[PDB]
Amino acid sequence: MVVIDLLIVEVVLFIAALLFSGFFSSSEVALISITRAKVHALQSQAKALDTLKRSTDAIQITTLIGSTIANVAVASLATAIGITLYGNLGIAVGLVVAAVLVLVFGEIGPKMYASRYTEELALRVSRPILFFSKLLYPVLWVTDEIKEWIDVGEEEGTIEEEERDMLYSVLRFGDTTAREVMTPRVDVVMIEDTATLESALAIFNETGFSLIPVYHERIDNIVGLLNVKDVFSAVFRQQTSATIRDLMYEPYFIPESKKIDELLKELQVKKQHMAVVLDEYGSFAGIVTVEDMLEELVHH
Amino acid sequence: VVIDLLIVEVVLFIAALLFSGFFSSSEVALISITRAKVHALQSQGRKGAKALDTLKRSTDAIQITTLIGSTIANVAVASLATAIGITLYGNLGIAVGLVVAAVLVLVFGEIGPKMYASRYTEELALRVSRPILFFSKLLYPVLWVTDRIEVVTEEEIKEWIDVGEEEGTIEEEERDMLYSVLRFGDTTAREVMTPRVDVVMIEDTATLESALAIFNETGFSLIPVYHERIDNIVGLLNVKDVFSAVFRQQTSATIRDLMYEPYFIPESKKIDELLKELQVKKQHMAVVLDEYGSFAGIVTVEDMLEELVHH
Protein backbone atom coordinates (compact mmCIF):
# COMPACT_ATOMS: atom_id res chain seq x y z
CA MET A 1 0.00 0.00 0.00
CA VAL A 2 0.95 3.68 0.18
CA VAL A 3 -0.25 6.87 1.84
CA ILE A 4 -1.41 8.53 -1.38
CA ASP A 5 -2.83 5.24 -2.66
CA LEU A 6 -4.87 4.51 0.48
CA LEU A 7 -6.16 8.08 0.70
CA ILE A 8 -7.35 7.91 -2.90
CA VAL A 9 -8.93 4.54 -2.11
CA GLU A 10 -10.55 6.14 0.92
CA VAL A 11 -11.79 9.23 -0.90
CA VAL A 12 -13.44 7.13 -3.60
CA LEU A 13 -14.89 4.96 -0.84
CA PHE A 14 -15.83 8.22 0.88
CA ILE A 15 -17.37 9.54 -2.34
CA ALA A 16 -19.13 6.22 -2.96
CA ALA A 17 -20.38 5.98 0.62
CA LEU A 18 -21.97 9.43 0.41
CA LEU A 19 -23.71 8.53 -2.86
CA PHE A 20 -24.91 5.27 -1.30
CA SER A 21 -26.52 7.12 1.61
CA GLY A 22 -28.48 9.30 -0.80
CA PHE A 23 -29.85 6.20 -2.53
CA PHE A 24 -31.01 4.72 0.78
CA SER A 25 -32.46 7.93 2.25
CA SER A 26 -34.25 8.99 -0.94
CA SER A 27 -35.62 5.46 -1.44
CA GLU A 28 -37.66 5.50 1.77
CA VAL A 29 -39.22 8.86 0.87
CA ALA A 30 -40.16 7.66 -2.62
CA LEU A 31 -41.14 4.20 -1.37
CA ILE A 32 -43.50 5.33 1.39
CA SER A 33 -44.82 8.47 -0.30
CA ILE A 34 -46.30 6.43 -3.15
CA THR A 35 -50.07 6.10 -2.89
CA ARG A 36 -51.39 2.58 -2.40
CA ALA A 37 -53.95 2.63 -5.22
CA LYS A 38 -51.36 4.14 -7.57
CA VAL A 39 -49.04 1.22 -6.79
CA HIS A 40 -51.69 -1.31 -7.84
CA ALA A 41 -52.41 0.45 -11.14
CA LEU A 42 -48.68 0.54 -11.92
CA GLN A 43 -48.39 -3.15 -11.03
CA SER A 44 -51.22 -3.93 -13.46
CA GLN A 45 -49.58 -1.81 -16.18
CA ALA A 46 -43.10 -2.44 -9.73
CA LYS A 47 -43.81 -6.04 -8.72
CA ALA A 48 -40.86 -5.71 -6.36
CA LEU A 49 -42.26 -2.40 -5.10
CA ASP A 50 -45.54 -4.12 -4.25
CA THR A 51 -43.58 -6.87 -2.50
CA LEU A 52 -41.72 -4.39 -0.30
CA LYS A 53 -44.94 -2.43 0.30
CA ARG A 54 -46.51 -5.55 1.83
CA SER A 55 -44.46 -4.83 4.98
CA THR A 56 -44.26 -1.03 5.09
CA ASP A 57 -41.99 -1.13 8.15
CA ALA A 58 -39.66 -3.56 6.37
CA ILE A 59 -38.70 -0.82 3.90
CA GLN A 60 -37.85 1.35 6.90
CA ILE A 61 -35.58 -1.27 8.47
CA THR A 62 -33.65 -1.99 5.27
CA THR A 63 -33.26 1.71 4.43
CA LEU A 64 -32.38 2.67 8.01
CA ILE A 65 -29.50 0.19 8.11
CA GLY A 66 -28.38 1.34 4.67
CA SER A 67 -28.30 5.05 5.49
CA THR A 68 -26.75 4.55 8.93
CA ILE A 69 -23.91 2.30 7.77
CA ALA A 70 -23.30 4.55 4.76
CA ASN A 71 -23.08 7.68 6.93
CA VAL A 72 -20.88 6.01 9.56
CA ALA A 73 -18.40 5.14 6.81
CA VAL A 74 -18.45 8.67 5.39
CA ALA A 75 -17.27 9.86 8.80
CA SER A 76 -14.99 6.86 9.35
CA LEU A 77 -13.23 7.47 6.04
CA ALA A 78 -13.11 11.27 6.15
CA THR A 79 -11.70 11.16 9.68
CA ALA A 80 -9.03 8.69 8.59
CA ILE A 81 -8.42 10.94 5.58
CA GLY A 82 -8.76 13.72 8.15
CA ILE A 83 -6.05 12.62 10.56
CA THR A 84 -3.59 11.60 7.84
CA LEU A 85 -3.85 15.21 6.58
CA TYR A 86 -4.29 17.43 9.66
CA GLY A 87 -3.23 15.22 12.58
CA ASN A 88 -5.31 14.83 15.71
CA LEU A 89 -7.18 17.97 14.63
CA GLY A 90 -8.19 15.91 11.58
CA ILE A 91 -10.89 14.12 13.58
CA ALA A 92 -12.44 17.55 14.15
CA VAL A 93 -12.01 18.47 10.49
CA GLY A 94 -13.30 15.05 9.46
CA LEU A 95 -16.20 15.34 11.89
CA VAL A 96 -17.08 18.82 10.64
CA VAL A 97 -16.88 18.11 6.91
CA ALA A 98 -18.35 14.60 7.05
CA ALA A 99 -21.20 15.95 9.19
CA VAL A 100 -21.93 18.75 6.72
CA LEU A 101 -21.92 16.44 3.70
CA VAL A 102 -24.06 13.69 5.24
CA LEU A 103 -26.82 16.25 5.82
CA VAL A 104 -26.51 18.18 2.55
CA PHE A 105 -25.91 15.28 0.16
CA GLY A 106 -26.73 12.24 2.31
CA GLU A 107 -30.00 12.88 4.13
CA ILE A 108 -31.53 16.36 3.95
CA GLY A 109 -30.86 16.87 0.25
CA PRO A 110 -32.10 13.58 -1.21
CA LYS A 111 -35.22 13.49 0.99
CA MET A 112 -36.52 16.78 -0.41
CA TYR A 113 -35.73 16.01 -4.06
CA ALA A 114 -37.39 12.59 -3.75
CA SER A 115 -40.85 14.19 -3.59
CA ARG A 116 -40.27 16.16 -6.82
CA TYR A 117 -39.29 13.10 -8.89
CA THR A 118 -41.00 10.53 -6.67
CA GLU A 119 -42.41 8.57 -9.62
CA GLU A 120 -39.27 7.54 -11.51
CA LEU A 121 -37.09 7.25 -8.39
CA ALA A 122 -39.56 4.92 -6.65
CA LEU A 123 -39.46 2.36 -9.48
CA ARG A 124 -35.71 2.60 -10.03
CA VAL A 125 -34.90 1.84 -6.37
CA SER A 126 -37.60 -0.83 -5.97
CA ARG A 127 -35.54 -3.81 -7.13
CA PRO A 128 -32.18 -2.93 -5.49
CA ILE A 129 -33.73 -2.11 -2.11
CA LEU A 130 -35.52 -5.46 -2.44
CA PHE A 131 -32.14 -7.12 -3.04
CA PHE A 132 -30.59 -5.39 -0.02
CA SER A 133 -33.60 -6.39 2.07
CA LYS A 134 -32.98 -10.03 1.15
CA LEU A 135 -29.34 -9.48 2.15
CA LEU A 136 -30.44 -7.75 5.37
CA TYR A 137 -33.25 -10.28 5.85
CA PRO A 138 -31.65 -12.38 8.65
CA VAL A 139 -31.17 -9.31 10.86
CA LEU A 140 -34.74 -8.30 10.04
CA TRP A 141 -35.88 -11.70 11.32
CA VAL A 142 -34.53 -10.70 14.73
CA THR A 143 -36.55 -7.46 14.66
CA ASP A 144 -39.80 -9.25 13.78
CA GLU A 145 -71.90 -4.91 31.73
CA ILE A 146 -72.73 -3.42 28.33
CA LYS A 147 -76.14 -2.31 29.61
CA GLU A 148 -74.51 -0.36 32.45
CA TRP A 149 -72.50 1.94 30.17
CA ILE A 150 -75.56 2.63 28.00
CA ASP A 151 -78.08 3.10 30.81
CA VAL A 152 -75.76 5.78 32.21
CA GLY A 153 -75.65 7.68 28.92
CA GLU A 154 -79.43 8.05 28.92
CA GLU A 155 -79.34 9.45 32.47
CA GLU A 156 -76.63 11.97 31.54
CA GLY A 157 -78.78 12.94 28.54
CA THR A 158 -76.11 11.59 26.19
CA ILE A 159 -78.33 8.88 24.68
CA GLU A 160 -82.04 8.65 23.95
CA GLU A 161 -83.67 5.36 24.91
CA GLU A 162 -85.24 5.14 21.44
CA GLU A 163 -81.77 4.97 19.82
CA ARG A 164 -80.64 2.16 22.14
CA ASP A 165 -81.35 -0.88 19.96
CA MET A 166 -79.53 0.48 16.91
CA LEU A 167 -76.54 1.36 19.11
CA TYR A 168 -76.44 -2.27 20.24
CA SER A 169 -75.84 -3.54 16.70
CA VAL A 170 -73.19 -0.91 15.93
CA LEU A 171 -71.25 -2.24 18.91
CA ARG A 172 -71.79 -5.87 17.87
CA PHE A 173 -70.72 -4.92 14.34
CA GLY A 174 -67.26 -3.73 15.39
CA ASP A 175 -66.73 -6.57 17.86
CA THR A 176 -67.83 -9.22 15.35
CA THR A 177 -64.97 -11.01 13.60
CA ALA A 178 -64.76 -12.67 10.20
CA ARG A 179 -64.59 -16.13 11.80
CA GLU A 180 -68.12 -15.72 13.18
CA VAL A 181 -69.88 -14.53 10.02
CA MET A 182 -67.96 -16.48 7.36
CA THR A 183 -68.91 -19.82 5.79
CA PRO A 184 -66.96 -22.91 6.91
CA ARG A 185 -64.56 -24.60 4.52
CA VAL A 186 -66.41 -27.92 4.50
CA ASP A 187 -69.53 -26.25 3.06
CA VAL A 188 -67.75 -23.99 0.55
CA VAL A 189 -68.09 -24.69 -3.17
CA MET A 190 -64.90 -24.93 -5.19
CA ILE A 191 -63.47 -25.59 -8.63
CA GLU A 192 -59.86 -26.46 -9.40
CA ASP A 193 -57.54 -24.17 -11.34
CA THR A 194 -57.28 -27.01 -13.90
CA ALA A 195 -60.87 -27.61 -15.00
CA THR A 196 -62.81 -27.00 -18.19
CA LEU A 197 -64.85 -23.80 -18.39
CA GLU A 198 -67.86 -26.01 -19.12
CA SER A 199 -67.51 -27.63 -15.69
CA ALA A 200 -67.46 -24.28 -13.89
CA LEU A 201 -70.73 -23.34 -15.61
CA ALA A 202 -72.24 -26.53 -14.21
CA ILE A 203 -71.06 -25.54 -10.73
CA PHE A 204 -72.45 -22.05 -11.32
CA ASN A 205 -75.90 -23.57 -12.02
CA GLU A 206 -75.99 -26.53 -9.62
CA THR A 207 -75.08 -24.21 -6.75
CA GLY A 208 -76.25 -20.98 -8.36
CA PHE A 209 -73.42 -18.80 -7.07
CA SER A 210 -71.54 -16.30 -9.24
CA LEU A 211 -68.10 -16.24 -7.57
CA ILE A 212 -66.76 -19.75 -6.88
CA PRO A 213 -63.26 -20.15 -5.40
CA VAL A 214 -60.41 -21.61 -7.42
CA TYR A 215 -58.22 -24.06 -5.50
CA HIS A 216 -54.88 -25.42 -6.74
CA GLU A 217 -54.55 -29.20 -6.40
CA ARG A 218 -55.37 -28.82 -2.70
CA ILE A 219 -58.43 -27.54 -0.85
CA ASP A 220 -56.08 -25.45 1.30
CA ASN A 221 -54.38 -23.64 -1.61
CA ILE A 222 -56.77 -21.09 -3.09
CA VAL A 223 -55.17 -19.12 -5.93
CA GLY A 224 -58.09 -17.14 -7.34
CA LEU A 225 -61.79 -16.43 -7.57
CA LEU A 226 -63.80 -17.06 -10.73
CA ASN A 227 -66.73 -14.90 -11.76
CA VAL A 228 -69.40 -16.64 -13.83
CA LYS A 229 -69.58 -13.68 -16.22
CA ASP A 230 -65.95 -14.40 -17.13
CA VAL A 231 -66.70 -18.07 -17.86
CA PHE A 232 -69.98 -17.60 -19.73
CA SER A 233 -68.29 -14.98 -21.92
CA ALA A 234 -65.32 -17.30 -22.53
CA VAL A 235 -67.20 -20.33 -23.86
CA PHE A 236 -69.34 -18.07 -26.05
CA ARG A 237 -66.33 -16.36 -27.64
CA GLN A 238 -64.72 -19.70 -28.54
CA GLN A 239 -61.18 -19.43 -27.15
CA THR A 240 -59.39 -22.67 -28.04
CA SER A 241 -57.08 -22.18 -25.04
CA ALA A 242 -59.25 -20.69 -22.28
CA THR A 243 -58.41 -22.14 -18.87
CA ILE A 244 -59.66 -21.10 -15.45
CA ARG A 245 -56.19 -19.82 -14.57
CA ASP A 246 -56.76 -16.92 -16.98
CA LEU A 247 -60.28 -15.92 -15.90
CA MET A 248 -59.66 -16.18 -12.15
CA TYR A 249 -58.66 -12.94 -10.43
CA GLU A 250 -56.28 -12.89 -7.48
CA PRO A 251 -58.26 -12.95 -4.21
CA TYR A 252 -58.01 -10.74 -1.12
CA PHE A 253 -57.02 -12.97 1.80
CA ILE A 254 -57.65 -11.96 5.42
CA PRO A 255 -57.04 -13.40 8.89
CA GLU A 256 -59.79 -14.81 11.07
CA SER A 257 -59.21 -11.93 13.52
CA LYS A 258 -60.24 -9.25 11.01
CA LYS A 259 -63.19 -7.21 12.26
CA ILE A 260 -66.09 -7.12 9.83
CA ASP A 261 -66.43 -3.32 10.06
CA GLU A 262 -63.05 -2.83 8.38
CA LEU A 263 -63.63 -5.63 5.87
CA LEU A 264 -66.80 -4.08 4.44
CA LYS A 265 -65.18 -0.67 3.94
CA GLU A 266 -62.12 -2.15 2.22
CA LEU A 267 -64.08 -4.48 -0.07
CA GLN A 268 -66.10 -1.65 -1.63
CA VAL A 269 -62.86 0.30 -2.13
CA LYS A 270 -61.22 -2.49 -4.15
CA LYS A 271 -64.41 -3.00 -6.23
CA GLN A 272 -64.55 -6.55 -4.83
CA HIS A 273 -67.34 -8.12 -2.79
CA MET A 274 -66.09 -11.54 -1.60
CA ALA A 275 -63.08 -12.17 0.62
CA VAL A 276 -61.01 -15.31 1.24
CA VAL A 277 -60.10 -16.27 4.81
CA LEU A 278 -57.00 -18.10 6.04
CA ASP A 279 -56.05 -19.53 9.42
CA GLU A 280 -52.92 -19.00 11.51
CA TYR A 281 -50.98 -21.66 9.56
CA GLY A 282 -51.77 -20.12 6.16
CA SER A 283 -54.39 -22.68 5.14
CA PHE A 284 -57.91 -22.07 3.78
CA ALA A 285 -60.79 -21.47 6.21
CA GLY A 286 -63.81 -19.90 4.51
CA ILE A 287 -65.21 -17.02 2.47
CA VAL A 288 -67.00 -13.89 3.70
CA THR A 289 -69.47 -12.16 1.41
CA VAL A 290 -70.85 -8.69 2.07
CA GLU A 291 -74.18 -10.46 2.58
CA ASP A 292 -72.69 -12.70 5.28
CA MET A 293 -71.49 -9.66 7.22
CA LEU A 294 -74.85 -7.85 7.13
CA GLU A 295 -76.87 -10.98 7.99
CA GLU A 296 -76.76 -10.14 11.70
CA LEU A 297 -78.12 -6.67 10.92
CA VAL A 298 -80.87 -8.25 8.81
CA HIS A 299 -81.87 -10.57 11.68
CA HIS A 300 -82.29 -8.34 14.75
CA VAL B 1 -0.04 12.25 25.50
CA VAL B 2 -1.48 9.27 23.62
CA ILE B 3 -3.20 7.61 26.58
CA ASP B 4 -4.86 10.78 27.89
CA LEU B 5 -6.22 11.74 24.46
CA LEU B 6 -7.58 8.22 23.95
CA ILE B 7 -9.37 8.71 27.28
CA VAL B 8 -10.88 11.98 26.03
CA GLU B 9 -12.18 10.28 22.88
CA VAL B 10 -13.64 7.25 24.67
CA VAL B 11 -15.87 9.40 26.90
CA LEU B 12 -16.81 11.69 24.01
CA PHE B 13 -17.69 8.49 22.16
CA ILE B 14 -20.01 7.37 24.97
CA ALA B 15 -21.46 10.89 25.09
CA ALA B 16 -21.89 11.15 21.32
CA LEU B 17 -23.76 7.84 21.36
CA LEU B 18 -26.08 9.19 24.06
CA PHE B 19 -26.95 12.30 22.03
CA SER B 20 -27.99 10.13 19.08
CA GLY B 21 -30.27 8.30 21.50
CA PHE B 22 -31.70 11.60 22.71
CA PHE B 23 -32.39 12.88 19.19
CA SER B 24 -33.57 9.49 17.92
CA SER B 25 -35.81 8.58 20.86
CA SER B 26 -37.25 12.09 21.10
CA GLU B 27 -38.05 12.09 17.38
CA VAL B 28 -40.33 9.05 17.72
CA ALA B 29 -42.05 10.07 20.95
CA LEU B 30 -42.70 13.69 20.00
CA ILE B 31 -44.36 13.09 16.63
CA SER B 32 -46.47 10.18 17.90
CA ILE B 33 -48.03 12.03 20.86
CA THR B 34 -51.41 13.12 19.50
CA ARG B 35 -51.98 16.88 19.50
CA ALA B 36 -55.14 16.26 21.54
CA LYS B 37 -52.95 14.73 24.26
CA VAL B 38 -50.60 17.73 24.12
CA HIS B 39 -53.55 20.04 24.80
CA ALA B 40 -54.43 18.04 27.91
CA LEU B 41 -50.92 18.32 29.38
CA GLN B 42 -50.76 22.12 29.30
CA SER B 43 -53.89 22.49 31.45
CA GLN B 44 -52.69 19.68 33.75
CA GLY B 45 -50.02 21.72 35.51
CA ARG B 46 -47.55 19.36 33.88
CA LYS B 47 -43.79 19.83 33.76
CA GLY B 48 -42.79 21.59 30.57
CA ALA B 49 -45.71 20.84 28.25
CA LYS B 50 -46.05 24.54 27.45
CA ALA B 51 -42.88 23.96 25.43
CA LEU B 52 -44.25 20.72 23.96
CA ASP B 53 -46.98 22.84 22.35
CA THR B 54 -44.59 25.34 20.74
CA LEU B 55 -42.88 22.51 18.86
CA LYS B 56 -46.07 20.80 17.68
CA ARG B 57 -47.11 23.81 15.59
CA SER B 58 -44.35 23.08 13.02
CA THR B 59 -44.10 19.44 11.95
CA ASP B 60 -41.03 20.12 9.79
CA ALA B 61 -38.94 21.75 12.53
CA ILE B 62 -39.21 18.68 14.77
CA GLN B 63 -38.00 16.49 11.89
CA ILE B 64 -35.12 18.86 11.09
CA THR B 65 -33.97 19.39 14.68
CA THR B 66 -33.88 15.64 15.33
CA LEU B 67 -32.27 14.80 11.98
CA ILE B 68 -29.53 17.43 12.25
CA GLY B 69 -28.75 16.35 15.80
CA SER B 70 -28.71 12.60 15.27
CA THR B 71 -26.66 13.07 12.09
CA ILE B 72 -23.94 15.23 13.65
CA ALA B 73 -23.98 12.95 16.69
CA ASN B 74 -23.66 9.80 14.57
CA VAL B 75 -20.86 11.30 12.46
CA ALA B 76 -19.15 12.12 15.76
CA VAL B 77 -19.56 8.57 17.06
CA ALA B 78 -17.86 7.29 13.91
CA SER B 79 -15.22 10.02 13.73
CA LEU B 80 -14.26 9.07 17.30
CA ALA B 81 -14.50 5.30 16.73
CA THR B 82 -11.96 5.51 13.90
CA ALA B 83 -9.72 7.93 15.81
CA ILE B 84 -9.58 5.49 18.73
CA GLY B 85 -9.60 2.60 16.27
CA ILE B 86 -6.78 3.73 14.00
CA THR B 87 -4.49 4.41 16.96
CA LEU B 88 -5.24 0.91 18.32
CA TYR B 89 -5.15 -1.19 15.13
CA GLY B 90 -3.14 0.74 12.56
CA ASN B 91 -4.90 1.33 9.26
CA LEU B 92 -7.21 -1.63 9.90
CA GLY B 93 -8.73 0.45 12.71
CA ILE B 94 -10.57 2.56 10.15
CA ALA B 95 -12.48 -0.64 9.36
CA VAL B 96 -13.09 -1.62 12.99
CA GLY B 97 -14.32 1.90 13.73
CA LEU B 98 -16.83 1.58 10.90
CA VAL B 99 -18.15 -1.73 12.23
CA VAL B 100 -18.30 -0.87 15.94
CA ALA B 101 -19.79 2.58 15.35
CA ALA B 102 -22.36 1.33 12.83
CA VAL B 103 -23.51 -1.60 14.98
CA LEU B 104 -23.74 0.44 18.20
CA VAL B 105 -25.41 3.53 16.71
CA LEU B 106 -28.16 1.36 15.22
CA VAL B 107 -28.75 -0.73 18.34
CA PHE B 108 -28.24 1.88 21.07
CA GLY B 109 -28.44 5.15 19.12
CA GLU B 110 -31.29 4.83 16.64
CA ILE B 111 -33.22 1.54 16.74
CA GLY B 112 -33.06 0.86 20.49
CA PRO B 113 -33.97 4.36 21.66
CA LYS B 114 -36.97 4.15 19.30
CA MET B 115 -38.27 1.21 21.34
CA TYR B 116 -38.30 3.24 24.56
CA ALA B 117 -40.20 5.96 22.71
CA SER B 118 -43.04 3.63 21.69
CA ARG B 119 -43.51 2.33 25.25
CA TYR B 120 -42.96 5.76 26.88
CA THR B 121 -44.05 8.35 24.32
CA GLU B 122 -45.67 10.71 26.84
CA GLU B 123 -43.15 11.14 29.67
CA LEU B 124 -40.19 11.18 27.28
CA ALA B 125 -41.83 14.07 25.42
CA LEU B 126 -42.18 16.26 28.52
CA ARG B 127 -38.63 15.30 29.52
CA VAL B 128 -37.20 16.29 26.11
CA SER B 129 -39.64 19.09 25.23
CA ARG B 130 -37.59 22.11 26.28
CA PRO B 131 -34.18 20.72 25.19
CA ILE B 132 -35.22 20.25 21.56
CA LEU B 133 -36.72 23.75 21.73
CA PHE B 134 -33.42 25.55 22.43
CA PHE B 135 -31.70 23.29 19.88
CA SER B 136 -34.19 24.68 17.36
CA LYS B 137 -33.37 28.28 18.31
CA LEU B 138 -29.64 27.81 17.65
CA LEU B 139 -30.28 25.75 14.50
CA TYR B 140 -32.44 28.64 13.24
CA PRO B 141 -30.40 29.59 10.13
CA VAL B 142 -30.61 26.10 8.62
CA LEU B 143 -34.33 25.84 9.40
CA TRP B 144 -35.06 29.05 7.50
CA VAL B 145 -32.91 27.70 4.67
CA THR B 146 -34.86 24.44 4.53
CA ASP B 147 -38.19 26.30 4.62
CA ARG B 148 -37.09 28.50 1.71
CA ILE B 149 -36.01 25.39 -0.21
CA GLU B 150 -39.46 23.95 0.57
CA VAL B 151 -63.06 10.14 -3.25
CA VAL B 152 -66.29 8.59 -1.96
CA THR B 153 -68.29 8.71 -5.18
CA GLU B 154 -72.01 8.24 -4.58
CA GLU B 155 -72.36 6.30 -7.84
CA GLU B 156 -69.37 4.08 -7.05
CA ILE B 157 -71.18 2.63 -4.03
CA LYS B 158 -74.42 2.25 -6.00
CA GLU B 159 -72.79 0.52 -8.97
CA TRP B 160 -70.45 -1.51 -6.74
CA ILE B 161 -73.42 -2.68 -4.68
CA ASP B 162 -75.68 -3.37 -7.67
CA VAL B 163 -72.78 -5.31 -9.17
CA GLY B 164 -72.77 -7.28 -5.93
CA GLU B 165 -76.54 -7.68 -6.07
CA GLU B 166 -76.05 -9.15 -9.55
CA GLU B 167 -73.37 -11.56 -8.30
CA GLY B 168 -75.64 -12.61 -5.43
CA THR B 169 -72.73 -11.66 -3.16
CA ILE B 170 -74.95 -8.84 -1.85
CA GLU B 171 -78.74 -8.83 -1.60
CA GLU B 172 -81.12 -6.15 -2.81
CA GLU B 173 -83.03 -6.36 0.49
CA GLU B 174 -79.88 -5.46 2.46
CA ARG B 175 -79.07 -2.33 0.43
CA ASP B 176 -80.19 0.23 3.03
CA MET B 177 -78.06 -1.13 5.88
CA LEU B 178 -75.06 -1.26 3.52
CA TYR B 179 -75.47 2.28 2.15
CA SER B 180 -75.82 3.59 5.70
CA VAL B 181 -73.01 1.59 7.33
CA LEU B 182 -70.65 3.04 4.72
CA ARG B 183 -71.66 6.61 5.60
CA PHE B 184 -71.33 5.83 9.32
CA GLY B 185 -67.69 4.78 9.01
CA ASP B 186 -66.80 7.58 6.58
CA THR B 187 -68.37 10.27 8.79
CA THR B 188 -66.07 12.58 10.72
CA ALA B 189 -66.57 14.17 14.12
CA ARG B 190 -66.94 17.60 12.51
CA GLU B 191 -69.99 16.41 10.58
CA VAL B 192 -71.73 15.36 13.83
CA MET B 193 -70.18 17.78 16.35
CA THR B 194 -72.30 20.44 18.00
CA PRO B 195 -70.41 23.57 16.91
CA ARG B 196 -68.41 25.55 19.43
CA VAL B 197 -70.72 28.55 19.11
CA ASP B 198 -73.78 26.67 20.40
CA VAL B 199 -71.99 25.03 23.36
CA VAL B 200 -72.69 26.05 26.97
CA MET B 201 -69.70 25.90 29.31
CA ILE B 202 -68.65 27.04 32.78
CA GLU B 203 -65.38 28.74 33.64
CA ASP B 204 -63.19 26.77 36.03
CA THR B 205 -63.11 29.79 38.36
CA ALA B 206 -66.90 29.75 38.75
CA THR B 207 -68.88 28.56 41.77
CA LEU B 208 -70.61 25.21 42.11
CA GLU B 209 -73.73 27.24 42.90
CA SER B 210 -73.37 28.93 39.51
CA ALA B 211 -72.88 25.58 37.77
CA LEU B 212 -76.26 24.37 39.05
CA ALA B 213 -77.88 27.42 37.48
CA ILE B 214 -76.38 26.37 34.15
CA PHE B 215 -77.44 22.73 34.53
CA ASN B 216 -81.03 23.77 35.25
CA GLU B 217 -81.27 26.60 32.72
CA THR B 218 -79.94 24.50 29.84
CA GLY B 219 -81.11 21.09 31.05
CA PHE B 220 -77.78 19.48 30.13
CA SER B 221 -76.12 17.10 32.57
CA LEU B 222 -72.50 17.58 31.43
CA ILE B 223 -71.15 21.04 30.55
CA PRO B 224 -67.50 21.61 29.57
CA VAL B 225 -65.12 23.79 31.55
CA TYR B 226 -62.94 26.51 30.01
CA HIS B 227 -59.98 27.74 32.03
CA GLU B 228 -59.66 31.24 30.55
CA ARG B 229 -61.07 31.46 27.00
CA ILE B 230 -63.88 29.70 25.17
CA ASP B 231 -61.14 28.42 22.86
CA ASN B 232 -60.03 26.33 25.85
CA ILE B 233 -61.66 23.21 27.27
CA VAL B 234 -60.03 21.78 30.39
CA GLY B 235 -62.68 19.39 31.70
CA LEU B 236 -66.27 18.24 31.84
CA LEU B 237 -68.54 18.74 34.85
CA ASN B 238 -71.35 16.33 35.76
CA VAL B 239 -74.36 17.86 37.50
CA LYS B 240 -74.71 14.72 39.64
CA ASP B 241 -71.31 15.52 41.16
CA VAL B 242 -72.18 19.19 41.73
CA PHE B 243 -75.45 18.37 43.51
CA SER B 244 -73.77 15.84 45.81
CA ALA B 245 -71.15 18.49 46.61
CA VAL B 246 -73.42 21.41 47.52
CA PHE B 247 -75.47 19.01 49.64
CA ARG B 248 -72.48 17.89 51.74
CA GLN B 249 -69.55 19.93 50.43
CA GLN B 250 -68.18 21.18 53.77
CA THR B 251 -64.88 22.06 52.07
CA SER B 252 -66.48 23.83 49.06
CA ALA B 253 -64.51 22.15 46.28
CA THR B 254 -64.09 24.18 43.10
CA ILE B 255 -64.76 23.13 39.51
CA ARG B 256 -61.16 22.04 38.96
CA ASP B 257 -61.53 19.61 41.87
CA LEU B 258 -64.78 18.04 40.62
CA MET B 259 -64.39 18.17 36.84
CA TYR B 260 -62.70 15.38 34.89
CA GLU B 261 -60.32 15.38 31.94
CA PRO B 262 -62.40 15.13 28.74
CA TYR B 263 -61.74 12.87 25.76
CA PHE B 264 -60.22 15.34 23.32
CA ILE B 265 -60.40 14.26 19.68
CA PRO B 266 -59.68 15.85 16.30
CA GLU B 267 -62.37 16.97 13.89
CA SER B 268 -61.30 14.01 11.70
CA LYS B 269 -61.91 11.19 14.21
CA LYS B 270 -64.19 8.77 12.38
CA ILE B 271 -67.22 8.28 14.61
CA ASP B 272 -66.83 4.54 14.02
CA GLU B 273 -63.66 4.81 16.12
CA LEU B 274 -65.12 7.43 18.47
CA LEU B 275 -68.03 5.23 19.55
CA LYS B 276 -65.93 2.18 20.45
CA GLU B 277 -63.29 4.39 22.08
CA LEU B 278 -65.83 6.35 24.13
CA GLN B 279 -67.84 3.34 25.30
CA VAL B 280 -64.62 1.56 26.28
CA LYS B 281 -63.72 4.59 28.43
CA LYS B 282 -67.29 4.39 29.86
CA GLN B 283 -67.44 8.07 28.84
CA HIS B 284 -70.09 9.23 26.40
CA MET B 285 -69.08 12.81 25.49
CA ALA B 286 -65.93 13.88 23.65
CA VAL B 287 -64.49 17.37 23.31
CA VAL B 288 -63.41 18.15 19.75
CA LEU B 289 -60.42 20.41 19.17
CA ASP B 290 -58.77 21.49 15.90
CA GLU B 291 -55.36 21.61 14.27
CA TYR B 292 -54.23 24.74 16.11
CA GLY B 293 -55.33 23.26 19.45
CA SER B 294 -58.36 25.53 19.87
CA PHE B 295 -61.91 24.42 20.74
CA ALA B 296 -64.36 23.50 17.99
CA GLY B 297 -67.28 21.55 19.46
CA ILE B 298 -68.42 18.46 21.32
CA VAL B 299 -69.79 15.05 20.38
CA THR B 300 -72.19 12.86 22.35
CA VAL B 301 -73.04 9.25 21.55
CA GLU B 302 -76.53 10.21 20.35
CA ASP B 303 -75.06 12.66 17.82
CA MET B 304 -73.09 9.85 16.18
CA LEU B 305 -76.18 7.61 16.03
CA GLU B 306 -78.78 10.27 15.20
CA GLU B 307 -78.34 10.58 11.43
CA LEU B 308 -78.17 6.80 11.12
CA VAL B 309 -81.34 6.15 13.15
CA HIS B 310 -83.37 8.96 11.56
CA HIS B 311 -82.26 7.78 8.10
Author numbering:
A (entry chain B): 1 to 45, 50 to 148, 169 to 324
B (entry chain A): 2 to 151, 164 to 324
What did the article's authors report about this structure?
Further insight into the conformation in the absence of bound ATP came from the crystal structure of a MtCorBΔC R235L mutant, homologous to a Jalili syndrome mutant (R407L) that is unable to bind ATP in human CNNM4. Crystals of MtCorBΔC R235L mutant purified in UDM were obtained by vapor diffusion in presence of 0.1 M sodium citrate pH 5.5, 50 mM Li2SO4, and 11% PEG4000, but they diffracted poorly to 6 Å. Subsequent additives screening improved the resolution to 3.8 Å with the addition of 10 mM MgSO4. In the apo structure, the TMD remains in the same inward-facing conformation, but the cytosolic domains undergo major structural rearrangements. The CBS-pair domain has completely dissociated from the disc-like dimeric configuration to a more elongated, open conformation with different domain-domain contacts. To our knowledge, this dimeric configuration is not observed in any available CBS-pair domain structures. In agreement with the AUC results, the loss of ATP binding disrupted the dimerization of the CBS-pair domain, which then makes contact with the helix-turn-helix motif from TMD. In addition, the dimeric AHB dissociates and binds to the CBS2 motif of the neighboring molecule, competing for the Mg2+-ATP binding site. The two conformations are interchangeable by a 90° rotation of both protomers. Despite the large dimeric rearrangement, the individual protomer in the two states is similar with differences limited to the AHB and α8 helix.
CNNM/CorB proteins are a broadly conserved family of integral membrane proteins with close to 90,000 protein sequences known. Structurally, CNNM/CorB proteins are defined by a conserved core consisting of a transmembrane domain (TMD) and a cytosolic cystathionine-β-synthase (CBS)-pair domain. Here, we determine the crystal structure of an archaeal CorB ortholog in two distinct conformations (apo and Mg2+-ATP-bound).
